Design a protein around this motif. Structure first.
Motif, PDB file in Angstrom:
ATOM      1  N   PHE E   3      -2.189 -10.058  11.093  1.00  0.00           N
ATOM      2  CA  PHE E   3      -1.732  -9.634   9.781  1.00  0.00           C
ATOM      3  C   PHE E   3      -0.310  -9.098   9.822  1.00  0.00           C
ATOM      4  CE2 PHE E   3      -2.397  -6.448   6.185  1.00  0.00           C
ATOM      5  CZ  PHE E   3      -1.864  -7.342   5.284  1.00  0.00           C
ATOM      6  N   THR E   4      -0.057  -8.132  10.701  1.00  0.00           N
ATOM      7  CA  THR E   4       1.249  -7.487  10.733  1.00  0.00           C
ATOM      8  C   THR E   4       2.346  -8.491  11.035  1.00  0.00           C
ATOM      9  OG1 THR E   4       2.543  -5.757  11.801  1.00  0.00           O
ATOM     10  CG2 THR E   4       0.962  -6.971  13.140  1.00  0.00           C
ATOM     11  N   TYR E   6       2.357 -11.789  10.385  1.00  0.00           N
ATOM     12  CA  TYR E   6       2.540 -12.526   9.147  1.00  0.00           C
ATOM     13  C   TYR E   6       3.433 -11.743   8.202  1.00  0.00           C
ATOM     14  CZ  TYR E   6       0.943 -15.217   5.059  1.00  0.00           C
ATOM     15  OH  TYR E   6       0.861 -16.002   3.935  1.00  0.00           O
ATOM     16  N   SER E   7       3.082 -10.477   7.991  1.00  0.00           N
ATOM     17  CA  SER E   7       3.782  -9.654   7.014  1.00  0.00           C
ATOM     18  C   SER E   7       5.245  -9.480   7.398  1.00  0.00           C
ATOM     19  CB  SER E   7       3.092  -8.300   6.902  1.00  0.00           C
ATOM     20  OG  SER E   7       3.189  -7.602   8.128  1.00  0.00           O
ATOM     21  N   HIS E  11       8.344 -10.889   5.209  1.00  0.00           N
ATOM     22  CA  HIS E  11       9.345  -9.946   4.744  1.00  0.00           C
ATOM     23  C   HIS E  11      10.733 -10.462   5.072  1.00  0.00           C
ATOM     24  CE1 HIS E  11       5.954  -7.063   4.452  1.00  0.00           C
ATOM     25  NE2 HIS E  11       6.730  -6.483   3.559  1.00  0.00           N
ATOM     26  N   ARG E  56       6.291  -2.270   0.588  1.00  0.00           N
ATOM     27  CA  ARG E  56       6.473  -2.537   2.007  1.00  0.00           C
ATOM     28  C   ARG E  56       6.441  -1.248   2.809  1.00  0.00           C
ATOM     29  NH1 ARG E  56      12.091  -4.670   4.680  1.00  0.00           N
ATOM     30  NH2 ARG E  56      11.383  -4.882   6.834  1.00  0.00           N
ATOM     31  N   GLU E  59       2.993  -0.110   3.395  1.00  0.00           N
ATOM     32  CA  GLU E  59       2.387  -1.104   4.269  1.00  0.00           C
ATOM     33  C   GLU E  59       2.716  -0.804   5.721  1.00  0.00           C
ATOM     34  OE1 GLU E  59       3.957  -3.539   6.228  1.00  0.00           O
ATOM     35  OE2 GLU E  59       2.011  -4.228   6.960  1.00  0.00           O
ATOM     36  N   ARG E  72      -4.552  -4.754   3.445  1.00  0.00           N
ATOM     37  CA  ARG E  72      -4.398  -6.165   3.133  1.00  0.00           C
ATOM     38  C   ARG E  72      -3.857  -6.342   1.723  1.00  0.00           C
ATOM     39  NH1 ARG E  72      -9.444  -9.833   4.845  1.00  0.00           N
ATOM     40  NH2 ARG E  72      -8.793  -9.028   6.885  1.00  0.00           N
ATOM     41  N   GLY E  75      -0.066  -5.009   1.334  1.00  0.00           N
ATOM     42  CA  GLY E  75       0.941  -5.898   1.858  1.00  0.00           C
ATOM     43  C   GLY E  75       1.058  -7.152   1.017  1.00  0.00           C
ATOM     44  N   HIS E  76      -0.081  -7.673   0.575  1.00  0.00           N
ATOM     45  CA  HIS E  76      -0.045  -8.933  -0.147  1.00  0.00           C
ATOM     46  C   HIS E  76       0.694  -8.785  -1.467  1.00  0.00           C
ATOM     47  CE1 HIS E  76      -2.263 -11.012   2.825  1.00  0.00           C
ATOM     48  NE2 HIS E  76      -2.644 -11.986   2.018  1.00  0.00           N
ATOM     49  N   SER E  78       2.926  -6.567  -2.173  1.00  0.00           N
ATOM     50  CA  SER E  78       4.325  -6.406  -1.821  1.00  0.00           C
ATOM     51  C   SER E  78       4.992  -7.757  -1.689  1.00  0.00           C
ATOM     52  CB  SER E  78       4.432  -5.610  -0.532  1.00  0.00           C
ATOM     53  OG  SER E  78       4.248  -6.461   0.577  1.00  0.00           O
ATOM     54  N   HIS E  79       4.368  -8.669  -0.953  1.00  0.00           N
ATOM     55  CA  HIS E  79       4.968  -9.986  -0.817  1.00  0.00           C
ATOM     56  C   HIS E  79       5.058 -10.676  -2.165  1.00  0.00           C
ATOM     57  CE1 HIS E  79       3.103  -9.973   3.507  1.00  0.00           C
ATOM     58  NE2 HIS E  79       3.769  -8.871   3.224  1.00  0.00           N
TER      59      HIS E  79
END
Lengths: 120, 120, 120, 120, 120
Positions: E3-4, E6-7, E11, E56, E59, E72, E75-76, E78-79
């Motif tokens: 996850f991290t 990906y994030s 970003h 972010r 997150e 989850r 972060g999502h 935020s994106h």
């Protein structure tokens, strides 16, 4: 230990938005100049962000030494000044977000002190 | 060991403000040119920041070898030149912060030498 | 092992100054165009910095494998091309720093080879 | 394991040159506009670099899982699209480097597949 | 733990494209102004990206604590906001990619929720 992470990430995004706002007002008037007009805002902006830098430096200096309140105050004020600068600068596009963000900074400091004094 | 941290962080913000000031004076006169006018300032600026870079490089070279005074001087002068450059450049917007920051650099070097010689 | 550090830091500042010079000549003539005039310089600039990138890549590829001369040459030429590019580009503001920096690059390569062959 | 290093460094410089080319054509015509003219190139550019980003992301996702061919293809195509974008964009300054770099990309993919199939 | 990674990577590229689009519309009209025209888009843009930053931050705060759904969602979203901002801004060049990217964001959220609820 949460503290340093918070501080670093906030530093990051704050730089982001400041640069972006400067990017925008690179796009103001092919008609007239606004460096002279609204002079005061930039004139304050420089010293403001300078306060910002000189705060962040001692903050990063004091990381390993103390997780306590002493560095807490420092880092927090450092984060303050920069948002203030972004406020003043963005003002020049319009006075609306100006006051909105004035108010947001106000409530932000309010919650800060709230949590600061809500417990010993 | 504080030293390298201090140096790195200061390097960072100094780059920040320099770029920002250049960003600003991307916004000077749609009326006339100022690259020609005030030529002297830029002409000195380039060599100045060049001194800056060539200092920082040997500083980062000398990290693992010595925490002593020899690298101390080097890093410190490196930090000097860049603030000097920012001063000269920003001058072009106005002569006020010009002298203010002249004075700030002055006192800054003063405190530097103060602490340098306050103890063996 | 000094080598990789030297290379990384120099890469960093070189990128810095290149971007800064481009920043400056974003500020040339609201009067006329200079993309067409002096075309040749930019036309060479692109390929030059391209040489730069393709060198740095294999340099960073060859780090763990060898600290020897083979990568030494590569990294060094990589650092060469970029300073060359900065020279050519800055020329357009004036021809003075042009020749000054021509000469500086000259002496720089001179000292390089000096130390290269001063010992086996 | 060479792979990830190669990919990271190439990502870096590719971003560098793309930004630089945009920097240049910030300097095209104080005479007329070219956002409208040559529209097609930018219109393709955006989607191209978007392909670029979405490729790099899954590439960095798949690092720890596999050093094999599956990620190999992904990363490689990611590197492709961006050079393609730089090509299309730079075209607008002139059509020479346009075709030169068309050809360079051609030979580049050629050597890629060459080494891909030269051995099992 | 995927996850991290990906994030972080997402970003990164998202910042990339946002800055690039701002770079482009630094190149709109030497004819007229468009800061005033289409005002609404920028006026929404600022607050949007602000949502982005403030998401972010928490997150990155919540990384070590939980790999679960709670972070989850954060972060999502935020994106989400940032892609939304890029959409709105790019609109000003044309209304085509506007709707195309509206639709892409739509399908993107669709697949998100699909995978969210496809399994317990």
């Amino acid at each position: 230990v949460k503290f340093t992470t918070y501080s670093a990430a906030v530093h990051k995004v704050l730089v982001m938005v400041n640069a972006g706002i400067l990017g925008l007002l690179q796009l103001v008037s092919q008609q007239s100049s606004v460096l002279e007009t609204h002079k005061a805002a930039f004139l304050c902006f420089c010293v403001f962000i300078l306060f910002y830098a000189v705060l962040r430096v001692r903050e990063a200096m004091d990381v390993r030494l103390q997780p306590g309140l002493v560095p807490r105050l420092i880092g927090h004020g450092s984060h303050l000044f920069g948002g203030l600068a972004a406020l003043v600068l963005v003002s020049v596009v319009s006075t609306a977000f100006s006051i909105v963000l004035f108010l947001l900074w106000f409530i932000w400091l309010s919650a800060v002190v709230y949590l600061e004094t809500n417990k010993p």
